[PDB]
């Protein structure tokens, strides 16, 4: 793992010791190379997971997330070059350093064998994110957004720390290999129920749930493009990874302590997908779609069946890619008109014909167009739930309908229709942002070709 982390560190001196002109090229290229190096984790020729030390490891669940996190860095760097073009060299270097630190901390979190390192880094991913949001966001709601984002997470995480320390005092170690073989039934009691709550609510607030999801749209709306990308793609997957890892020691309390959360998720899916219809802000639309999608992940993880974990992993990967893509697409038009409203620019297929194919393909991946992996996850989650209770497919299906509806609405009222002739400032598409969409899309094709990689420990 050091062979993936130490290069990510040396990227920092490469960022600072580089000439102002060649600072972006070097870091971008070497980040691509590190994304390449991260592909050795897929060399799993057995059912024996990779343990590199007492601290670093990588299972079939953490490897996809690590590769996605190593691959998103250069895309964020690229997306973050049109803005920052008028900022000073030191500010650009500081932005790049924030992004690199995020990459490093996330790779650590996904490689961690122990839950205390996971927690420390889970929390350390707040500093660079908050800085990015509040320092390079454009409107004044930056600050309230950062506040929400900090304190939802911390108020959720503190109980998690208490519960981890309790488990330490009771068992002797917070290692994940040991806590899986040395396990005991949790006697059903209010104490252990509060332990379940403590262990879960931090992640549930980070996925997020329906009842607690207001920190996400504020951030995405008020966050620069890179922050939105990393947030949507990884900083939500963080909670699902945590739940999947920690739900082994909460058996069987998960059988009856889940109904509230399964239910909230299944219903908030509908609520959010419906919000995505009467929504003026494109970024808010993307965020509410993300919430609708993560609700399924939460429910799946709650029922903890193999099909369920598999669909959840696939949906995590695919949603990360496609949401990063949609935010890139939105910011493309934002850089022209400097407005987030989806009603102002509504004929962009008559000027950007190629960029519209990216909109089309993304909105098709947003909805479940097969054989996309955005669809296999939804399908296996639907199947797991149907097995759970045959009355879930009702809500699943109305969510499907609403999903198609608002994705089509997005692309229609944004690209199709009559062009806004007063928008003389609609410069053609930049090779850079086109490369961005291509790099977001092609990996989806490749995964759809080889889904065995993004299944997870269950398969």
């Amino acid at each position: 793992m050091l062979k993936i982390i130490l290069p990510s560190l040396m990227l920092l001196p490469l960022t600072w010791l580089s000439s102002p002109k060649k600072t972006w090229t070097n870091v971008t290229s070497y980040s691509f190379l590190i994304s390449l190096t991260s592909l050795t984790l897929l060399w799993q020729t057995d059912e024996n997971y990779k343990n590199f030390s007492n601290m670093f490891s990588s299972d079939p669940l953490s490897t996809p997330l690590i590769i996605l996190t190593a691959w998103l860095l250069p895309l964020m760097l690229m997306a973050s070059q049109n803005h920052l073009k008028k900022d000073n060299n030191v500010l650009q270097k500081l932005y790049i350093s924030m992004l690199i630190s995020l990459q490093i901390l996330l790779i650590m979190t996904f490689s961690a064998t122990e839950l205390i390192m996971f927690y420390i880094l889970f929390e350390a991913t707040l500093i660079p994110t908050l800085i990015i949001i509040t320092r390079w966001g454009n409107q004044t709601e930056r600050l309230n957004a950062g506040i929400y984002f900090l304190f939802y997470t911390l108020i959720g995480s503190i109980p998690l720390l208490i519960a981890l320390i309790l488990i330490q005092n009771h068992v002797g170690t917070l290692n994940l290999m040991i806590l899986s073989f040395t396990t005991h039934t949790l006697d059903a009691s209010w104490s252990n129920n509060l332990l379940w709550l403590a262990c879960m609510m931090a992640f549930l607030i980070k996925m997020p749930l329906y009842g607690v999801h207001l920190w996400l749209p504020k951030a995405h709306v008020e966050a620069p493009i890179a922050g939105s990308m990393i947030l949507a793609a990884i900083l939500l997957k963080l909670g699902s990874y945590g739940m999947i890892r920690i739900s082994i020691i909460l058996d069987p309390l998960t059988k009856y302590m889940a109904y509230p959360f399964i239910l909230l998720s299944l219903w908030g899916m509908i609520m959010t997908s419906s919000i995505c219809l009467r929504q003026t802000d494109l970024k808010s639309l993307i965020a509410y779609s993300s919430v609708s999608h993560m609700a399924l992940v939460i429910a799946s993880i709650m029922i903890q069946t193999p099909w369920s974990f598999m669909g959840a992993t696939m949906l995590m990967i695919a949603h990360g890619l496609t949401s990063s893509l949609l935010f890139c697409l939105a910011n493309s038009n934002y850089e022209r008109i400097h407005s987030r409203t989806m009603i102002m620019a509504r004929g962009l297929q008559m000027v950007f014909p190629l960029m519209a194919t990216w909109w089309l393909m993304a909105s098709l991946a947003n909805l479940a167009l097969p054989p996309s992996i955005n669809l296999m996850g939804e399908l296996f989650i639907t199947m797991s739930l149907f097995s759970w209770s045959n009355f879930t497919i009702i809500l699943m299906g109305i969510n499907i309908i609403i999903t198609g509806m608002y994705s089509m609405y997005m692309i229609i009222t944004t690209q199709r229709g009559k062009l806004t002739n007063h928008m003389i400032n609609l410069q053609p598409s930049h090779t850079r942002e086109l490369t961005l969409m291509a790099l977001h899309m092609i990996p989806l094709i490749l995964l759809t070709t080889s889904p065995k990689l993004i299944t997870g420990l269950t398969m």
């Binding site: 059912e47 024996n48 290999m177 040395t182 739900s247 082994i248 903890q304 369920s308 420990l457």
Partner: protein, 171 residues
């Protein structure tokens, strides 16, 4: 190429041509043309490639793992014995999935070859399917996404308890 004892394929008793007219069959002549035009150059390419294979021929083997004490022979808390036993259980679990898949494939192929008379002539495969499915159910079914050997063991134990209590009673 592939074993019959594993993927059995009956002999396909074929009926002979009984032409009863003067018109030509456009399929036999098109078929001779297709053979001469496609199968021959392709067969030649394949001969050449198989010869280049014969040159610099390479071998590869099947990994044999030895048997190691199951978790029954392991102690509560001993993570070494448990680790080995659980890796084994996962190996055997993957193997059992592939067995069930082999059987599903045999069933599909049987149903396809039979056709309309698949309720007959395709009950042996369906019976093997029912049998192995009952077994798989009874040894791997109600485990969660965190399936391990201890859970399978507890399931086996509760099943044997219920059966032994249905046998002791009524005796």
């Amino acid at each position: 190429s592939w074993d019959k004892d594993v993927y059995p394929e009956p002999p396909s008793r074929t009926p002979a041509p009984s032409p009863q007219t003067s018109l030509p069959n456009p399929i036999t002549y098109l078929t001779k043309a297709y053979d001469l035009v496609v199968d021959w150059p392709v067969t030649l390419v394949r001969e050449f490639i198989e010869r280049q294979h014969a040159k610099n021929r390479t071998y590869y083997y099947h990994r044999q793992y030895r048997r190691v004490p199951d978790i029954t022979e392991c102690k509560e808390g001993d993570v070494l014995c448990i680790y080995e036993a659980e890796m084994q259980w996962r190996r055997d679990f993957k193997v059992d999935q592939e067995i069930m898949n082999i059987i599903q494939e045999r069933l599909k192929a049987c149903q396809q070859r039979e056709g309309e008379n698949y309720q007959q002539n395709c009950a042996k495969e369906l019976e093997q399917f029912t049998k192995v499915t009952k077994a798989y159910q009874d040894r791997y079914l109600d485990l969660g996404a965190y399936y391990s050997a201890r859970k399978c063991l507890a399931k086996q134990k509760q099943r044997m308890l219920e059966e032994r209590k249905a046998a002791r009673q009524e005796a």
